[PDB]
């Protein structure tokens, strides 16, 4: 169905300022809007979006209000300026998914049979991506219901277009990477990976702590996946693995040795050239 | 021979009752760690120069 | 029952546990490999079985605490390596 | 003679001194040499006859061989002694490098991309 979704910075800025301008008026918690984008093969692209009047009550999670005519006429109005765009799904800025999401998704599945839900965090505090992508599906199991509606995650990333790229480059004057080389290849890849892995393990720790003491709704799929995780850890004490590891490392170090030798030779040549060329400049002054 | 064996000069063993010395053969030095060090030294040198 | 380390088991153990003689045990494991219940490989000349993967199962609430403890002393290695790599290569960029 | 393993000449000359008594130091040398020979025999042997130790170490049959073996424990009797050696501790582990080699590569990177 869907493999990857790509998000442009334009919709992010639109989400941010919509949240600001609607939350300044009063103490609302969640806001809703509709996205526009394009399809190609199994890859989805999001270009722009517009807001919509939405109301929800904190007293109960079964009462809420959206506007149909607003959405219809606003889509018709954006049609007259660019016909390539089309309705693809909706977004809500909630920190975490709510109970009513299934109902709203069913409500606006009429305009797009393959609606995709997107969650944007407006005040991130970590290095992770602010966007999360979900798609509805029907799940089946042993007993309880033949089918049940459930969300499933889809990989998301932030893309860029040429004009958008030059705009965001002009906007990001203060912050720019120091060097491109082993620096950006090391810190941006390895340390952040350790951070993310530790965070994930902490979250699963928290859920496991919630069980066998507290609420205790023992679920079995999580247990099956945990067994699969704990069974897949390799063993590094095997003799053959150690021998192969040593062989490959010894094979690899020779190349660095050779490159260092070449660099030393080039440095000596440069020193000779500079000294010879510069020693012949003092006598010209007389 | 014993004194030579004790300090790690050779890896052989001798049978007093019999008399002969049975050398121990073990070769596969490329799987050993030591070439890594033997390259580390020169690499550091070439980086300093 | 057996731990992840040292999962190799002999023919006579199967023969005693299943109350059959040796000559059929191969076929048994063959069947156990055919229907995909367990994944592994089997030797003949040395009378050994190398067992690799078995299906998961449900288990009570006093057993998951073992997995919780394993996560407990798993997270600390990641944290320690994080700190070591961060401190060792500080001046490469502040 | 003492620098290398030749030991028979030491005890042979210990009964031949042309200078004077010198007996205050030859006894200390004898004790140290006997102790180090006992230390050496412990390595590279899994079988030896009981009388062979009496031949190698110059106490012949004074009952001191059993007390001496009490000092250096040994294991078995039946006119035989045995020793066990492992020496596989250093091999079969790649975890021990995993940190020092990471430090070495980090050092290479650090002194490879700093402006001097």
- DSSP per-residue string spanning A111-149: S-TT-EEEEE-SS--SSS-SEEEEEEEEE--SSS-S-EE
Nearest CA in chain D to C90: D110
Tokens at B39, concatenated:
């390259």
Under 8 Å between Cβ of D24 and D14: no
| Count of CB pairs separated by less than 8 Å, A with B | 32
Which of B2, B33, B40 has the CB atom closest to D104's CB atom? B40
CB contact under 8 A, B47 and D52: no
* Interface check D109 vs A, CB under 8 A: yes
φ, ψ of residue A130 to 5 degrees: the values are: -80, -10
Alpha helix positions (H), chain C? 11-18, 25-34, 64-88
* Interface check D47 vs B, CB under 8 A: yes
* Interface check D104 vs B, CB under 8 A: yes
Show the domain range for B27.
23-49
Query: Do B and C make contact, counting contact as 3+ CB pairs within 8 angstroms?
Result: no
- Residue A42, classified by CB atoms within 10 Å of its CB into exposed (0-12), middle (13-18) or buried (19+), is exposed
The structure was resolved to a resolution in Å of 3.4
**β-strands A32-40, A43-51: how paired?**
antiparallel
Under 8 Å between Cβ of A4 and A44: yes
Contacts 24+ apart (CB under 8 A), B26-34: B30/A247, B30/A250, B31/A243, B31/A246, B31/A247, B32/A246, B33/A246, B33/D97
CA distance A208 to A210: 5
Under 8 Å between Cβ of A45 and A38: yes
Helix and strand counts by DSSP (H, E) for chain B:
2, 2
φ, ψ of residue A68 to 5 degrees: the values are: -85, -50
DSSP state of D80: B
CA distance C77 to A201: 12
CA distance D61 to D84: 27
* Interface check D95 vs B, CB under 8 A: no
CA distance A121 to D39: 72
Under 8 Å between Cβ of D36 and D42: no
CA distance A92 to A52: 11
Q: Which of B37, B38, B39, B40 best tests the A interface by mutation, with the highest count of A CBs <10 A?
A: B39
* Interface check C35 vs A, CB under 8 A: no
Query: Do C and A make contact, counting contact as 3+ CB pairs within 8 angstroms?
Result: yes
């Amino acid at each position: 169905a869907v493999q990857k979704v790509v998000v442009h910075p334009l919709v992010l800025l639109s989400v941010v300022d919509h949240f600001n301008r609607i939350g300044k008026v009063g103490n609302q918690k969640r806001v809703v809007g509709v996205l526009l984008g394009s399809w190609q093969k199994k890859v989805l692209d999001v270009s722009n979006s517009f807001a919509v009047p939405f109301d929800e009550d904190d007293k109960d999670d079964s009462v809420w209000f959206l506007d149909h005519d607003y959405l219809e006429n606003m889509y018709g109005m954006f049609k007259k300026v660019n016909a390539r765009e089309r309705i693809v799904g909706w977004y809500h800025t909630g920190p975490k998914l709510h109970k009513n999401d299934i109902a709203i998704n069913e409500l606006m599945k009429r305009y797009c049979p393959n609606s995709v839900l997107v969650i944007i965090d407006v005040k991130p505090k970590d290095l992770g991506l602010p966007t999360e992508a979900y798609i509805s599906v029907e799940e089946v199991h042993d007993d309880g219901t033949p089918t049940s509606k459930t969300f499933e995650h889809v990989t998301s990333e932030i893309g860029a277009e040429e004009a958008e790229e030059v705009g965001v480059e002009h906007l990001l004057r203060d912050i720019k990477d120091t060097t491109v080389g082993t620096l950006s290849q090391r810190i941006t890849n390895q340390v952040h990976g350790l951070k993310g892995l530790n965070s994930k393990l902490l979250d699963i720790r928290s859920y496991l702590e919630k069980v066998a003491t507290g609420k205790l709704p023992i679920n079995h799929q999580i247990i099956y996946q945990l067994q699969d995780v704990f069974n897949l850890l390799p063993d590094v004490s095997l003799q053959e693995f150690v021998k192969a590891f040593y062989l490959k490392t010894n094979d690899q170090m020779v190349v660095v040795y050779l490159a260092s030798l070449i660099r030393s030779v080039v440095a000596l040549h440069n020193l000779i050239n500079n000294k010879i060329a510069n020693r012949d400049a003092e006598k010209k002054e007389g | 021979v014993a004194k030579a064996i004790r300090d790690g000069v050779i890896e052989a063993s001798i049978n007093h009752e019999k008399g002969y010395v049975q050398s121990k053969e073990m070769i596969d030095i490329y799987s050993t760690r030591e070439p890594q060090l033997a390259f580390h030294q020169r690499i550091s040198f070439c980086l300093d120069i | 029952t057996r731990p992840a380390n040292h999962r190799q088991l002999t023919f006579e153990e199967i023969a005693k546990s299943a109350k059959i003689t040796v000559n059929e045990v191969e076929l048994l494991v063959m069947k156990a490999l055919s229907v995909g219940l367990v994944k592994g490989s089997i030797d003949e000349v040395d009378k050994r079985v190398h067992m690799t993967w078995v299906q998961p199962r449900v288990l009570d609430l006093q057993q998951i605490k073992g997995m919780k403890d394993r996560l407990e002393f798993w997270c600390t290695d990641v944290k320690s390596m994080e700190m070591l790599v961060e401190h060792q290569a500080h001046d490469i960029l502040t | 003679y003492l620098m290398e393993g030749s030991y028979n000449k030491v005890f042979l000359a210990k009964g031949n001194i042309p200078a004077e008594s010198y007996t205050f130091f030859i006894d200390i040398l004898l004790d140290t040499i006997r102790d180090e020979i006992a230390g050496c025999i412990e390595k590279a042997y899994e079988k030896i006859l009981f009388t062979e130790a009496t031949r190698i170490l110059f106490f012949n049959t004074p009952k001191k061989m059993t007390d001496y073996a009490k000092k250096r424990g040994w294991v078995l009797g039946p006119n035989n002694y045995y020793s066990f050696a492992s020496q596989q501790q250093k091999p079969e582990d790649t975890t021990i490098p995993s940190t020092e080699l990471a430090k070495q590569v980090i050092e290479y990177a650090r002194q490879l991309e700093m402006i001097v």
